[PDB]
Amino acid sequence: KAAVERSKMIDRNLRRDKRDARRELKLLLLGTGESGKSTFIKQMRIIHTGIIEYPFDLQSVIFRMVDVGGQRSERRKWIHCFENVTSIMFLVALSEYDQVLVEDNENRMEESKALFRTIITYPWFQNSSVILFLNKKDLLEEKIMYSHLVDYFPEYDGPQRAQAAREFILKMFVDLNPDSDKIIYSHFTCATDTENIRFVFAAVKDTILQLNLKEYNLV
Amino acid sequence: EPFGIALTLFAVLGIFLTAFVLGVFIKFRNTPIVKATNRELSYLLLFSLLCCFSSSLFFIGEPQDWTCRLRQPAFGISFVLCISCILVKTNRVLLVFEAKIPTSFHRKWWGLNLQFLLVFLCTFMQIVICVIWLYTAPPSSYRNQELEDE
């Protein structure tokens, strides 16, 4: 009676596991280099080259964040694995406007913009929200009296060559998106800015409510 | 008598107002706030309200067997239909807005089958009670002259 008992037990255990795995979520932390990924992760992990996933333990839902930046290979060949992911936690650093790169004499802001455009332009990522975290705000706020962006950037004909305004870079990133774009959730953070995990849950609830409200056709 | 002319001249105004309201929901059938409320079940309610105003016109005139039999069940069914529509619409939105993880409806059309079948399930209990009642003891007219002599 071996075959029937083994099959029945295996099917029962598999069905129980599938039922128990109903409450789960996946998100990817796709960010550029030197964005403080470890620093950002440590703050939220304290309280509230392999692919490593962090099993967050939020209320009634076990969140899963996967680190994918450290691959150093082709992206389109394995980006098909993540299709059920509901949000992209894209990350940039605001201090790259004057931190020129010469290792190609082009500023890392151009590379970050190109990466953002490539990721957003993907037809596969059509039913997933976009979270645009901006880190290292203190450097941009402080050192601007010696780093005016009138020459380093062509679309900052503002007051003069102080009084930092991050809204210009915000507009530069936002304009790089197609029409009828979904709401882009962007909250500026710092080294010890605690209020980020709750910004994430805010976008997740909103990303789902909008979808179900679309599905039950209530509009 | 003018009292009869009156109740009738109200029950036409109500019909006209209900017709006017259904016309907006048909002309402006794609605005965000119209689609916010269920534009299926909102239509069905309006028809039930039309049925409600009409039931009253079965109390005017000399009573007869069929009129006396149809007087109460029509109004009861119409009112419970309206109540069921309201109840099912309210529960759907609470459910929509009590959503943790996303939807899983397997077929879009059957999806809106639940929206309609629940109302019929609610109305089934009184359609039953009306049917058994009418067959086991139907109402009938009765000329009464005992209470007052003249």
Side-chain angles (χ1 to χ4, degrees), chain A residues 2-5 7 10-15 21 23 25 27-44 49-71 73-83 85-95 97 105-109 112-138 140 143-145 147-148 150-151 153-154 156-159 162 164-166 168-176 178 180-182 184-192 194-214 216-219, chain B residues 2-26 28-61 63-97 99-100 102-112 114-150:
Chain A
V4 55
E5 279 202 359
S7 50
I10 290 309
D11 291 331
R12 198 182 300 178
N13 295 14
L14 198 51
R15 214 206 49 79
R23 34 164 188 80
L25 261 175
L27 299 94
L28 73 165
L29 186 63
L30 196 147
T32 68
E34 214 187 327
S35 300
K37 285 174 173 295
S38 56
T39 306
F40 189 60
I41 288 298
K42 277 168 63 171
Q43 289 266 318
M44 46 181 59
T49 190
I51 299 298
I52 174 64
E53 45 187 358
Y54 288 119
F56 283 164
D57 313 320
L58 299 199
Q59 55 168 359
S60 307
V61 188
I62 294 288
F63 275 17
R64 274 181 46 229
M65 319 279 167
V66 297
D67 292 336
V68 74
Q71 196 61 80
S73 73
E74 288 285 81
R75 183 158 38 242
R76 330 170 308 275
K77 311 313 289 169
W78 45 255
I79 200 166
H80 65 85
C81 300
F82 322 119
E83 189 46 53
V85 56
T86 185
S87 292
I88 296 90
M89 300 178 36
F90 185 77
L91 177 56
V92 291
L94 270 171
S95 179
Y97 71 103
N105 279 23
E106 55 91 22
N107 45 4
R108 205 137 55 237
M109 293 299 291
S112 308
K113 289 167 54 59
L115 177 56
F116 187 83
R117 181 204 292 107
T118 300
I119 291 313
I120 295 314
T121 302
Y122 269 117
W124 271 340
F125 291 128
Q126 203 45 246
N127 297 8
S128 305
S129 58
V130 180
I131 309 182
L132 182 60
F133 272 96
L134 275 81
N135 201 295
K136 207 183 289 185
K137 190 254 296 180
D138 51 5
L140 174 60
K143 300 191 58 184
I144 201 160
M145 193 270 288
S147 63
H148 48 249
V150 186
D151 57 69
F153 270 101
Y156 184 25
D157 194 73
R166 66 181 65 88
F168 299 107
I169 307 302
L170 187 151
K171 169 189 184 297
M172 183 170 281
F173 289 166
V174 162
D175 205 4
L176 198 56
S180 171
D181 190 12
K182 61 186 72 66
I184 294 182
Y185 310 125
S186 50
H187 206 185
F188 313 97
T189 183
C190 289
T192 181
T194 312
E195 298 173 354
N196 280 320
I197 186 166
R198 303 199 199 89
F199 189 69
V200 175
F201 246 83
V204 149
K205 150 90 164 302
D206 196 278
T207 304
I208 304 176
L209 201 141
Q210 199 68 17
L211 192 146
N212 290 349
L213 202 73
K214 223 56 184 65
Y216 278 72
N217 210 3
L218 261 57
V219 182
Chain B
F3 216 70
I5 306 180
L7 308 170
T8 299
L9 230 57
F10 277 72
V12 167
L13 187 135
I15 288 286
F16 175 79
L17 262 70
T18 299
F20 182 75
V21 163
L22 187 37
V24 159
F25 282 41
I26 306 163
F28 286 105
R29 71 197 166 283
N30 44 5
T31 63
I33 182 67
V34 161
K35 283 191 295 194
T37 313
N38 308 62
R39 65 169 170 180
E40 310 117 337
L41 277 183
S42 82
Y43 278 17
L44 172 67
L45 192 145
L46 280 168
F47 169 71
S48 179
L49 259 61
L50 282 169
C51 281
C52 284
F53 283 138
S54 188
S55 48
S56 80
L57 280 185
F58 289 162
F59 294 87
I60 321 294
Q64 302 172 39
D65 287 327
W66 53 282
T67 46
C68 294
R69 283 175 300 179
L70 294 170
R71 71 203 285 97
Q72 295 181 358
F75 166 75
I77 286 187
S78 296
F79 210 72
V80 166
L81 195 69
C82 307
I83 293 312
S84 184
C85 288
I86 280 174
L87 209 74
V88 65
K89 166 173 47 182
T90 291
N91 191 13
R92 191 161 173 89
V93 186
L94 272 51
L95 163 70
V96 175
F97 265 81
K100 283 280 187 69
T103 50
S104 72
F105 282 167
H106 38 269
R107 183 182 73 184
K108 282 218 48 177
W109 267 0
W110 167 76
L112 273 304
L114 281 196
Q115 200 139 326
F116 279 80
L117 189 151
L118 279 161
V119 177
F120 290 173
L121 166 65
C122 282
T123 309
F124 167 81
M125 172 69 176
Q126 291 183 357
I127 200 166
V128 158
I129 200 64
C130 298
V131 157
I132 173 176
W133 181 39
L134 212 53
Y135 279 12
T136 197
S140 179
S141 164
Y142 180 34
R143 262 197 177 193
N144 215 6
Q145 50 165 351
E146 325 305 318
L147 61 80
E148 280 170 28
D149 305 347
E150 336 200 329

